[PDB]
């Protein structure tokens, strides 16, 4: 029952007060391009630092945030609903965006990174990721052999879905997805 004088604090807590660390890419082949967008700059710059700290723990060498060109829309409208036309005013909607590109990233590890950002996404930010991956010839046979592998991973996930025996509200399965997807996206 004695008191110990801690020489320092956990590195997880110290790293929160340093600039986000970055791994070094040995080859430099891009494995993911995450483009973040928002109408504000304060939440976009904050979440980009948070996204770089996650890429460090996963061993992903991230590059950026690269400031991409601003997307500026413009509208000139009359200030009066009725006749008065010699008086108009300009409006705009500037989209601020950043790019975080990961290189030499393992395909699965890159998907945990993306899965983490979506779970802890910051409000007011839209995200889009392009993932790359190398594969061998014979894609047809590769995707048929991996069926048994994916089935085992889903054994515990089928519980999410449940329907009455011989679901009749669906009808044509494929046509249901195609039409239900449009209804979810709002038209397309």
């Amino acid at each position: 029952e004695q008191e110990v004088i801690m020489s320092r604090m956990p590195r997880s807590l110290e790293a929160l007060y340093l600039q986000p660390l970055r791994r070094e890419a040995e080859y430099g082949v891009p494995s993911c391009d995450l483009q973040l967008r928002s109408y504000s700059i304060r939440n976009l710059e904050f979440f980009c630092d948070f996204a770089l700290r996650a890429a460090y723990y996963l061993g992903l060498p991230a590059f950026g945030p690269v400031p991409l060109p601003r997307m500026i829309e413009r509208w000139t409208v009359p200030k009066s609903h009725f006749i008065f036309k010699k008086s108009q005013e300009n409006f705009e909607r500037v989209t601020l965006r950043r790019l975080i590109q990961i290189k030499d990233g393992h395909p699965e590890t890159v998907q945990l990174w993306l899965a983490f950002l979506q779970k802890h996404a910051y409000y007011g930010i839209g995200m889009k990721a392009n993932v790359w991956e190398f594969s061998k010839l014979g894609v047809s046979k590769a995707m048929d052999e991996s069926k048994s592998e994916v089935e085992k991973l889903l054994e515990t996930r089928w519980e999410h879905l449940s329907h009455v025996s011989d679901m009749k509200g669906v009808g044509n399965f494929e046509d249901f997805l195609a039409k239900e997807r449009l209804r979810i996206s709002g038209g397309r």
Partner: protein
């Protein structure tokens, strides 16, 4: 070996090396960046704009649901209250007022913020609190006493079943019916007022709002201590007062302004500018070379090797009993918390947090009423009254000369504008209201 397709992406390496340059210029403090949720009602971005075009319309529908949701009341038959029927429609000022909703959107959910001024709780809590302690003290005796004579022989047991408890309970109700229905009234009306902010009743409102956004909505209800701290709640209250025919317009505006308390100020110091001088306390100027390989390499202090020793000198550390001392731990169901979480003192952090927030104090107040507000039922002319107390200026920029961040390209970040439209028996009128913060 490797693939050719792979080698064609290695050679494309013309990157610029991070130089770690040393700053030789003096840096000022960054502007005050106001929150993002206060620029647009919907803080959102989506790549498919089909989820973006109906938001202006939904804001109207959502605000209607929230307004009517907070006005829910028991039926007179549930509380046994005798309804006093009458033709006139009574205006209720002692309810929960709510402002327009601010929604933070993600691809997974939406956080709906709404500022409320709970005026009904102020009355119910004081009214029920008048019931003195003797009520509950004596009521306990009736329980014990009743068990000695009814559920026992004349002067937990295995010969007392629920079939007897029922009769034993009805006897108490029959003798205290006029008193229980009274306590039940205020107890239920107070709990209803309480559950409106809890998940007991909010999970139902979620099902109604969730149909507009197709995402689960999380509520962030902020209770305002004064109805003057939010413009939406202010113009709403002033509008309900003016809706009565016999309402004295000018008198009602004066009573509201009298309730508004402005802080003491020195006019000569507030309107005094600021001379731009390098602040050597800023972490940017104190260390012009931010690399630890230079800071921790015995630059100024003698053996401050530990990165923690450096951080403790810059920031306020709660883990330390002495602010610039040492972090001494103790070495040899219940909640899972550190053995020192109870000793942590967030006394100076509240100062750090709340001093870094601008526009806290109420700076100025402005009310405008315009429309048909005469008392007689004829075709008179429109009225227009204006009252104000304080100013709507952005003192940080107009006087001190600091740089501000205007909202939506033209609006001052310290003012709240809200308009509420109503109508008398003779025509329509509107109540505009501005509220600024210092």
């Amino acid at each position: 070996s490797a693939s050719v397709i792979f080698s064609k992406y290695i050679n494309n390496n013309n990157n610029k090396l991070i130089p770690f340059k040393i700053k030789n210029s003096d840096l000022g403090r960054t502007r005050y960046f106001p929150p993002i949720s206060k620029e647009w009602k919907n803080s959102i971005y989506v790549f498919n704009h089909n989820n973006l075009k109906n938001l202006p319309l939904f804001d109207i529908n959502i605000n209607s649901l929230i307004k009517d949701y907070f006005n829910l009341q028991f039926k007179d038959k549930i509380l046994f209250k005798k309804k006093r029927l009458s033709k006139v429609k009574v205006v209720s000022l002692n309810k929960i007022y709510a402002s327009k909703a601010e929604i933070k959107h993600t691809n997974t959910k939406a956080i709906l913020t709404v500022y409320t001024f709970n005026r009904e709780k102020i009355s119910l809590y004081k009214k029920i609190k008048k019931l003195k302690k003797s009520f509950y003290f004596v009521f306990d005796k009736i329980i014990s006493f009743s068990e000695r004579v009814i559920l026992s022989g004349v002067p937990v047991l295995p010969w007392i079943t629920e079939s007897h408890v029922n009769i034993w309970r009805k006897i108490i109700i029959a003798s205290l019916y006029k008193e229980l229905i009274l306590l039940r009234k205020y107890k239920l009306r107070l709990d209803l007022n309480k559950y409106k902010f809890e998940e007991k009743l909010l999970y139902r409102l979620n099902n109604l709002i969730m149909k507009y956004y197709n995402k689960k909505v999380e509520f962030n209800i902020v209770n305002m201590r004064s109805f003057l701290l939010n413009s939406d709640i202010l113009t709403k209250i002033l509008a309900l007062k003016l809706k009565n025919r016999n309402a004295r317009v000018i008198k009602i505006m004066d009573v509201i302004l009298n309730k508004a308390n402005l802080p003491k100020i020195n006019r000569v110091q507030e309107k005094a500018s600021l001379i731009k001088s390098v602040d050597w306390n800023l972490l940017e100027n104190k260390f012009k070379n931010l690399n630890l390989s230079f800071i921790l390499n015995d630059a100024s202090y003698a053996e401050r090797n530990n990165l923690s020793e450096l951080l403790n000198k810059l920031y306020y550390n709660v883990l330390l009993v002495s602010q610039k001392g040492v972090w001494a731990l103790r070495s040899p169901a219940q909640p899972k918390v550190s053995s020192f979480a109870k000793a942590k003192k967030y006394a100076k952090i509240y100062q750090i947090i709340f001093n870094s927030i601008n526009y806290k104090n109420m700076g100025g107040l402005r009310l405008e009423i315009k429309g048909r507000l005469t008392k007689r039922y004829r075709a008179d002319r429109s009225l227009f009254k204006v009252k104000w107390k304080g100013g709507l200026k952005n003192l940080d920029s107009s006087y001190k000369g600091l740089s501000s961040v205007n909202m939506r390209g033209y609006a001052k970040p310290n003012v709240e504008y809200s308009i509420f439209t109503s109508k008398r028996r003779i025509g329509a009128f509107a109540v505009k209201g501005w509220v600024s913060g210092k």
